[PDB]
Structures are given as C-alpha cells and as structure tokens.
Design a binder for this molecule. Sequence first.
Ligand SMILES: [Mg+2]
Ligand SMILES: [Mg+2]
Ligand SMILES: [Mg+2]
Ligand SMILES: [Mg+2]
Ligand SMILES: [Mg+2]
Ligand SMILES: [Mg+2]
Lengths: 312, 55, 121, 206, 70, 63
Amino acid sequence: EVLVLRGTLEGHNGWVTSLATSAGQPNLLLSASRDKTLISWKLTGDDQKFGVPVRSFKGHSHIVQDCTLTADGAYALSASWDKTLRLWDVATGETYQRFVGHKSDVMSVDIDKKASMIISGSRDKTIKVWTIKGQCLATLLGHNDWVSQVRVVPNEKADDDSVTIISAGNDKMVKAWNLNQFQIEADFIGHNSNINTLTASPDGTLIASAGKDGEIMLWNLAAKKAMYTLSAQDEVFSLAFSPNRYWLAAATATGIKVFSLDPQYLVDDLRPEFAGYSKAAEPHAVSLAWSADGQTLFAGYTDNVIRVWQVM
Amino acid sequence: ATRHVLMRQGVLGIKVKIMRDPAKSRTGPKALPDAVTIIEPKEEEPILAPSVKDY
Amino acid sequence: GRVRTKTVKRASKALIERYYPKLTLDFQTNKRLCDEIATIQSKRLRNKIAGYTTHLMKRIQKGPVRGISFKLQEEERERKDQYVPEVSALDLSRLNVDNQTSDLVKSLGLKLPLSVINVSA
Amino acid sequence: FTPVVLATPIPEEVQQAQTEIKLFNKWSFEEVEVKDASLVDYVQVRQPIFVAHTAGRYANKRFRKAQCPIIERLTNSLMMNGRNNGKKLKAVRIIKHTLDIINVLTDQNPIQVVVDAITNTGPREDTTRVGGGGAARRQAVDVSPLRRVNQAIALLTIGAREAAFRNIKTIAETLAEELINAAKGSSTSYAIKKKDELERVAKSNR
Amino acid sequence: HVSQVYAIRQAIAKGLVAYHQKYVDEQSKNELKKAFTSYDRTLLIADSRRPEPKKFGGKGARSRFQKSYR
Amino acid sequence: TPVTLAKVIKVLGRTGSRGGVTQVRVEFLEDTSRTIVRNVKGPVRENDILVLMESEREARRLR
RNA sequence: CGAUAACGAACGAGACCUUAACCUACUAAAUAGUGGUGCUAGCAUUUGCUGGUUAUCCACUUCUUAGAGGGACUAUCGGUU
RNA sequence: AUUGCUCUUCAACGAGGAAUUCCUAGUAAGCGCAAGUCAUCAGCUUGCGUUGAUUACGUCCCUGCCCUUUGUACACACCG
Ligand SMILES: [Mg+2]
Ligand SMILES: [Mg+2]
Ligand SMILES: [Mg+2]
Ligand SMILES: [Mg+2]
Ligand SMILES: [Mg+2]
Ligand SMILES: [Mg+2]
C-alpha cells in the first residue's frame, strides 16, 4: 500500500476550500471553492481527465467556505461567507432552505447521521443548531474567539441515538457539546496557536485537532484524556481519518503528510510536481477528503485544481 | 460663523471657527477618517501541558 | 502610482508587532481579523491596511524587514544561530609564528608548541 | 457540411459560414501570410473576424493596438478630416466596397493585397530634428515596426482622401487603387511617393 | 442603434450559456463559454466604459474653450 | 541590395533633444554575436525586429 | 524607500464625501416590469406566430427603482531594481 | 424688419500668410436634446445622452513655475 498521483480535476477559479463525498455514490464528489460556487463531479476512471463536473451550484454572493453531503447524496449543504447557509438539490439545483441568523462568516457545516438537525459554527462566536425547515434551535456560548470548524461525532455503537459535536476555534481550546439538553462537557486544553481544523475518527472515540503550531494533537474522547501530540513541523489546514484503515492524512504547508497511527510513522510524504511557480511558493492543499471505501484520497489545492491519490 | 461689527471707522468682520472633539460626538462618526487604533492583545503564558477539564 | 502613505504603512507595521502569530499570508483572512481587532472608519482604508500587511508577511518569510521590533521575531532568529561547527577554526589539531611573536611569548613566561617562520619585508 | 433547419429560417450562405471556417464578410484569413519578418507580430491576422467594426478598447496600454486586426485599423483611419469624425458604419461600408473592387480588378485575394501594401509603405529609415543652432539640423534614425505599420495606414488613407476629394471617383474606388499601386510598388502611389521621399532625406543625412 | 446591436448579441450569448448551466450538464457550458470568450470577450462581459461628466469651462470633459492672451 | 534584420535584446533609454528617440542594443539575426547600439524613432519593446538599412554604424547619444 | 544628528508627529497631498460602473445574494413594488390564465383580433392550421384588454385574477423580481450590505486590496504568477 | 412661415432675389467663400489654441479614451471630434435667463426672442452657458478615431505611454528643446549651489554695496527688495 503506497500512494500515487492518478489524475486531476479542473473546474474552479478559486481555492478549493472543501471536498466532500457520500458513501451512497462513489461516483460523487462535491467540491466547494473560493469562487462562491460548488461543483459536483462524475468520477469516471481514466488515465487522464479522471472525473468530470456535471452540476454547478451558484447562488452564494461571497466565498463558500465548506460543504457537507447527506448520506444518500441527494442533498447538499454549503456554508458561505455571506452569513448564509444553502441546502441544495444535486439533481435540480433549486435550493430548498436558506438558513439565516448567523451575523458573520459561517465556517463549517455538518448534517446529522439521521439528517435531522444541522450544526453551524460561524465567526460570531456562536454554534447555531437548525431544523431541516430552517429554525435556529440554540446558540451555544462560552467561546472567546471565533469558531473555525465544527463536526459531528459518528455513532458506531448500536442504539446510540445521542449526538455530540466537536468545535475548534482560534481561542486555542476545543469543546464537546451534548445537544439534547444543550450542555458543554469537555474542555481539551493544550494548544498554543490558532486551531485550523479538527477531525473525529469513525471509531467516534478519537479526536485529532491541528492548528497553526504544527502540532496535530491527538485526544481520546472516550476517556476524556490526551493521547499524544504528533508533529507535522509546519502549519496545517485539514485532517481526515480513513474509514477502514487506522490512518490519518494531514495537509501541511509543504505537502500532505499522511500518518499511520499504529506504528506511528508517516508513510509517503507525497509532493506533486507543478511545472512553474517555483520562486514564490508551491501551491498547497487546503482541503483533503477520503472516499467511502478509503481507496482514493482527494486534495484541493490553492492553484484551483484537485489532485487525487490512489492506494496500492 | 461670520459677523459684521459696525464701528465708526468701518465694518469689522469677525470669523469664528470651532473644531469640536470627535470623541464627544454621540451622533455619527466618532473619529477622524484616518484614525486607526489597534487594540493591545492581553498576553498570556504558554501552557506546555495538555489537559482535559471535565463535567 | 500606487505608493502607499504613512497611515497604511504605519498602522500595518504596528499591527504586525502585536498580532504576528494570528495573521497569515492570505488577504481574505487578514481582512477579517483586522476588522474586529482594530477600528478603521472606512472599508477602503481597511482594505489597504490589510493588503499591505499581507504583503509585509511574505517579506517576513524570507529574512528580516527593517523597522519592526517585536521580541518574538529576533528571539527565534536568535534560536537558530549556533550551526554547531565541527571543529573550532582556532584549534589546529596538528602553531605558526614570526620571530617577534616567539620572543613575545618567551617574554610572557609561557611554553607552548610553536613553529617559527620568517615573515620578511 | 449538413444544413440544419429551425423555426426561423436562416439564409443558407450565412449558414455555411458557421462550421466551415469563421471567415470575413466574403474572404478567408488563410493564405494571408505577411511576407516581411519585421512587420509580422504587428499586423494581426490569423484570428479572423466577421465584421471590421469591433467596439474594442485598445488604447489603454502601449502596444495593445498591435492586437487590433489590421482591417479594423484600416477602417479607423478612414473617419478623418473632421466632417467624418465618428461615422464608423460609413467607414466599414467603404472598406467592404474597396475589398470588392480589389478582388474584381485583380483576382488575387483582397486582404492579401492590403497586407503587403502596408509593408511596402512603411518607411524604413526616417529623419529627426536636432537643433544645431538657428538652422535646424537633420539626423537619420531607424523606425519601429509598430511605427512603420502606424505610418503605413496613415500614408495610405491620406492619399485616398486627397485624390477622392473634389472628384467624381468615390472614396472606395480611390482607396483600392493606391492599395493596389502600393502593394505592387510603383512610385505612382502617394504612399510609395512619400515613403521614398523620407528615405532620401534620411539618406542625405546618412 | 449600434449600442442596441451589441446588447442583443450579449443577451443571446449569455442566455444560451445560462440555459446550459441550469438544465444541461456543465461540460456543455464550458465548451460554449470558451468558444465565446476566445473570439470576443464582450459577448459575455459587459463593457465597463462609461460616460465622463462634462466640466464647466469647455464643451467636453477634457476640452477647454479657447485661451487668448491679447 | 543589403538590409540586415536585427532582434532587440535590451532597450537602453531615451535620447535626443525632445526625447522621442531610444537607444537600443540589437542583435543581428544572421551573423549573431555581433552587437551594436542604434537609434529608434517609434515605440519599441524588446524581441522586436528592426531593419537596419546599414549595419556599420553606431550612435551613442544625441546632443 | 533609503542614506542619515536625528527621533517622533501635525496641517496640506492621501484618507473623507458625492457620483458612475458589479450583484439571477437580502428586503419589496398595477406611479416599474415580465410570464400565465380569463376575453378577444389577425394569420396559419398540429400541438403554433404576433398583437390588443384594465378591475380577468394568481404567482414572480431577471430587467426598472433605493434601502441595507458585499466586492478591489494593483489579488496571483513571472521579470527587473 | 421681436420671433415664426411662404414665395422670390441667391453675395463672399474653391481649405485660408505670419501667428496661435485645446486635447491622451467612451477621451478628441461629429450630432442633437433639456435646463438657466424667458410675456416674446439662442448662433450663449450649465448639463445630458448618441456616434466614436489617429497618436504617445516620452523629455527638458521652447514657454512657464519650483528647488539647489553661488555672488551681492539690494531689503518700499533690479520698476533696487
Ligand atoms: Mg468622391
Ligand atoms: Mg518585464
Ligand atoms: Mg509655434
Ligand atoms: Mg459639438
Ligand atoms: Mg563678484
Ligand atoms: Mg540694505
């Protein structure tokens, strides 16, 4: 098992800020970009031009910061810097519900496992939870600087109706929230820099958080205690665990350092070739995503193309 | 404001210009256009030990 | 001409002195965090202070820029300055002298391994 | 080529022009290779246009006019001597009739006649004004390829204008004949006559 | 008259590219857009050149009337 | 009859009394590695091709 | 910017304000405008084309208008100092 | 002869010497309209649209203005 660059997707004009896929269609990929649009892709397997765009979602006035997809892949939600959220139909465009009530940039969105309620972290230091019809159930406070990314933990154990969320902002302190009675539970102290991202494992018991310091820092949320802190040695943007292996991928400013965690070694240090751009900087990935089966690793870079990486 | 005082030699004009303080305004702009103030960040010590508070 | 004035160039360097670890090499994130953390009365001036602050950061990735002194930056420059040189350039493991150096060290009352060479005019 | 029909009938001769090649009102932009290697990159051909009236903005930067098509620049010099200022629909009619006349009078392609005409009437060396004291002195210097194209269009159109003035000949049939006369190169064209006149004064001053 | 012609061509070019955006896939949009934008850019983007206000002291915006000294 | 085509490699600066004339350093297409300084009247950038009507001459400046 | 017995500011320049350009993003509208559905006219005749109509009414905001906002900061890359 | 209309009469002028003005893109130039003055009267002005170029992206040659060095017996300051 080793990674190789198979192909690249080109549909955008701004930084591909987020990727998302859905387990129901392994030929699906939803990519959000800085040109305030979303593109859905038909993953055709070919030597060149692997994957083709088919649907564009336009309708956000300023930068769309991320996207999440429903499990079946019928609906998409996109969070944008125009203080709105838009729920879209991948088939017909034609947005159903527009969520307003955040007063600043919304940064991350995540739909429920049962697709019932919708969490939203914004730059107005609040975490608003919404219906499918669009009403903000709660406003979750105590959070000094602004929220930078939120996600939901995966229920893997049978008969856990419970849903708890994870939040990371630039106050160097990440939190856990039980949304059935709207409490705060955990205060994972320990970061020294602006936390850019956080990821829950499909185990639902691990959380890796990572920021400006370069410490991809690992926490066991099953016991509520720190596990260890990894080191990527420069600034990092996104993390994602593989759905099958015991693996973690990380978007450093140099490249994608991807980590196995059981013998604790980085495996490849993949760095693609760019044919230009050499003086200033090479463009760097700002958003990565695994497949459902974990076969393909997707990466959107700052040169508005999307590079893929295949296992062997 | 401008006034004409009528003396016995001729008219004496009186101009008065008053610059009010922008801070005491309470209605509209509180500062001049190019006044920029950066707020001083409150400085705290690095933690160097990872911990979880619980509930 | 697009030469920036004092106000843009002065507020930005003050802003970098006290907010260097927060802000980044992207104008957009930069134009958002200044907007809370400082008071600028107009949107056009906020866009030029943030735009020059983004420009100054890229200069800071490669070496020091004159006119900033925040205690962090020099200390990190201080940290990566040893280079731990293999052997001291002064030490010869396997010293040379003129005649006047030789009678100088004989005047000092020191005996030390010396090789005398004539240094002529 | 298969003709497609639709609810509004579109004429068949314009319908042919859609896929086949995107050529001019009647003439093709292929086989229109400019000969001289200095004047290439400054006549802008091989990106064909349908009509010689493009509402383009070429005046912003220093050399954007070199990307403007050479048939467009030919029309632009026609709307001159004051009474004709504006009137671009007047200019592109005249250019259409001029190109028709050139094709009827010699079988060879009209725009190829126009492109080698301006290469002939670019002045290669030209004089400048050094003072020298009282009596103004001449110094021969060399000409830019952009200036050579610039001079050529002006030299061609002034000759057409002064000859089609107070005269039964229309401006279109006048504009053709100096364009023919220059493209062969005759010294009976005004643009050729002016060109050698500048070079002799330059030759006088080396 | 000639302004009306350019507004017509931009409207039908944008209308065609909007139709393929909503209903047809995005592949047909990009080949449609590229052929337009390669030939002439103002088929899709409106020209930004606006009128310049007239100033007292001259007939136009730049021109002045005549200076005479004697 | 001789003319030489010459590719400009470095534009030097404006000369002449009014300023309408530019010193350029041109390279000949055939017989390269021969360099000369000449005067140009119009707008010139680099990688342009002049037609020198005679190559055995060099100006430096115009006073 | 740099040199530098000068450092750090003030007025003027700049910022500011008005106006013109962008917004299928928000709030809305027979004193703005489409599309339909009624009622009709003409031409065809297939399943259409172009109009007229103020009490046909239902929805709409693209275009028109002005409130609030967003957006450009020479952004990104290359070259040269 | 206020101005408007009809008919008739149907002059100079065939691109203008020495001189000289304005202008760098929706700009110059062409072309009209509204407003101001207004009982009536625009060949004027202030604005607005319509049609839309050529040339340059420089320099101190001319003309002005600014600065430096310098001399001064000037300081209502060379009209001293
Ligand atoms: Mg005639
Ligand atoms: Mg360059
Ligand atoms: Mg004169
Ligand atoms: Mg006029
Ligand atoms: Mg003396
Ligand atoms: Mg005295």
